[PDB]
Ligand binder design. Structure first.
Ligand SMILES: *[C@@H]1O[C@H](CO)[C@@H](O[C@@H]2O[C@H](CO)[C@@H](O[C@@H]3O[C@H](CO)[C@@H](O)[C@H](O[C@H]4O[C@H](CO)[C@@H](O)[C@H](O)[C@@H]4O)[C@@H]3O[C@@H]3OC[C@@H](O)[C@H](O)[C@H]3O)[C@H](O)[C@H]2NC(C)=O)[C@H](O[C@@H]2O[C@@H](C)[C@@H](O)[C@@H](O)[C@@H]2O)[C@H]1NC(C)=O
Ligand code: HEM
Ligand SMILES: *[C@@H]1O[C@H](CO)[C@@H](O[C@@H]2O[C@H](CO)[C@@H](O)[C@H](O)[C@H]2NC(C)=O)[C@H](O[C@@H]2O[C@@H](C)[C@@H](O)[C@@H](O)[C@@H]2O)[C@H]1NC(C)=O
Ligand SMILES: O=C(O)Cc1c[nH]c2ccccc12
Ligand SMILES: [Ca+2]
Ligand code: NA
Length: 307
């Protein structure tokens, strides 16, 4: 593992709810079997939360920008509704199984993301626990400052990541999250219209134009054209074929700082999986609340209102 943030530990709930991790995994395994895309939704939700203020469940709050109440966001800042619901359903199950409110929503996010990776065929890894839940709503400015757009090139991505102490190795490995899940036409339409972006494989560009025949097409397509739902290194095989979906994907292969790692991971899924496991655990410790800071929410969608 990477270093543990102060206040976090492996198996934090060993005494207070030893079954907690097992309960989350069982729920995710069943839920994803019914709704395959939920795994991508849960992984994304953990990333997104971490990049918006810190890994503190701020984005779960009804009232947070990009939260479950959000009606005034663009398609690519409108997160999958089933993933918000799954976190709450898991947290409800934990209330019953733990004998009360014990496990933070922030910890559920980190666990559910790991279980999503695993059920999709990805690597298992230990998740540090002990996070606590923010009582601050995320604002639009928090979202816009924290999250790079898919139009961003590597230097801009690295600048954002450096503020949260992630480097180019983490960028390339973590971007492999796009080995599962969906993207909206509007996140990549500028690469098609008016003319095709020269960095896009021309054969793929032709296929995407059926998928998104004009700007403003309200449709989603897999991030990974090779294996949409399997967690694997095919994301990187796409890049080396110039078939990354977003600018922020394909620039990983273009840019001198990141190209070697893209090649490495396209050639070795084991190398990708090892680095992903390290980097995603690093990501999930960004600006965490620990000790008595923050709350253990009784309802992941609301701040606790009675102490
Ligand atoms: C723009 O996108 C196109 C797809 O939309 C690319 O076309 C594809 O290119 C790939 C190679 O990159 C072709 O697949 C290969 O086909 C040959 C002949 O059948 C196989 O021998 C070869 O398998 C070997 O190499 C693999 C690594 O590349 C190894 O993993 C494998 O074990 C073998 O050692 C390979 O076959 C693929 O192997 C992996 C399997 O999972 C997969 O199912 C199998 O297909 C592919 O046939 C081709 N498809 C199309 C529709 O043309 C295109 O690539 C460029 O253009 C093509 C025509 C070829 O000249 C490529 O060599 C070339 O890179 C890409 N344009 C880019 C990359 O600029
Ligand atoms: C840091 C640079 C990143 C950028 C620019 C980026 C951008 C985006 C965009 C634009 C989408 C599609 C949204 C849409 O159009 O609806 C998305 C989806 C997704 N991203 Fe990222 N991403 C980044 C990093 C990450 C990381 C670090 C992970 C996880 C490790 C991740 C996992 C996902 C997943 C799984 C989806 C699909 C969600 C779904 O299907 O519900 N991304 N990404
Ligand atoms: C958990 O907190 C949520 C956020 O406060 C509650 O959701 C909401 O309830 C309000 C009605 O009291 C409503 O105005 C908001 O629109 C809504 N927000 C969202 C995103 O749904 C939620 O309460 C429940 O579920 C909603 C849909 C209603 O049926 C309520 O009567 C339910 O209590 C809270 N969940 C629980 C179990 O308390
Ligand atoms: O199809 C919808 O409207 C639900 C939705 C919102 N954002 C999403 C991201 C990925 C998959 C589905 C959705
Ligand atoms: Ca895949
Ligand atoms: Na957050």
């Amino acid at each position: 593992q990477p270093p543990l943030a102060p206040g976090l530990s492996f198996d934090f709930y060993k005494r207070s709810c030893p079954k907690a991790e097992s309960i989350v995994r069982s729920f995710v395994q069943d839920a994803v079997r019914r709704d395959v895309g939920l795994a991508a939704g849960l992984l994304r939700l953990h990333f997104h939360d971490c990049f918006v203020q810190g890994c503190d469940a701020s984005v779960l709050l009804d009232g947070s920008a990009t939260g479950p109440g959000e009606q005034q966001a663009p398609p690519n800042l409108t997160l999958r509704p089933t993933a918000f619901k799954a976190i709450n359903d898991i947290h409800d199950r934990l209330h019953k199984e733990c004998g009360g409110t014990v496990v933070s929503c922030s910890d559920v996010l980190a666990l559910a993301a790991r279980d999503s990776v695993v059920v999709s065929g990805g690597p298992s890894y230990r998740v540090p626990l002990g996070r606590r839940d923010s009582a601050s709503f995320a604002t639009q400015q928090d979202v816009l400052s924290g999250l790079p757009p898919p139009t961003a090139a590597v230097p801009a991505l690295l600048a954002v990541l450096s503020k949260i102490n992630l480097d180019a190795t983490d960028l390339v490995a973590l971007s492999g999250g796009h080995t599962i899940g969906l993207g909206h036409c509007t996140s990549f339409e500028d690469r098609l219209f008016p003319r095709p972006d020269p960095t896009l494989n021309a054969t793929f560009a032709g296929q995407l134009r059926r998928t998104c025949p004009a700007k403003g097409t309200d449709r989603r397509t897999p991030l990974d054209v090779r294996t949409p739902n399997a967690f694997d290194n095919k994301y990187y095989v796409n890049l080396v074929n110039r078939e990354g979906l977003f600018t922020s994907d394909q620039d990983l292969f273009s840019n001198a700082r990141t190209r070697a790692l893209v090649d490495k991971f396209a050639r070795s899924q084991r190398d990708f999986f090892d680095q992903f496991a390290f980097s995603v655990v690093k990501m999930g410790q960004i600006k965490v609340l620990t000790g008595t800071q923050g709350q253990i929410r009784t309802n992941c969608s609301a701040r606790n209102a009675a102490g």
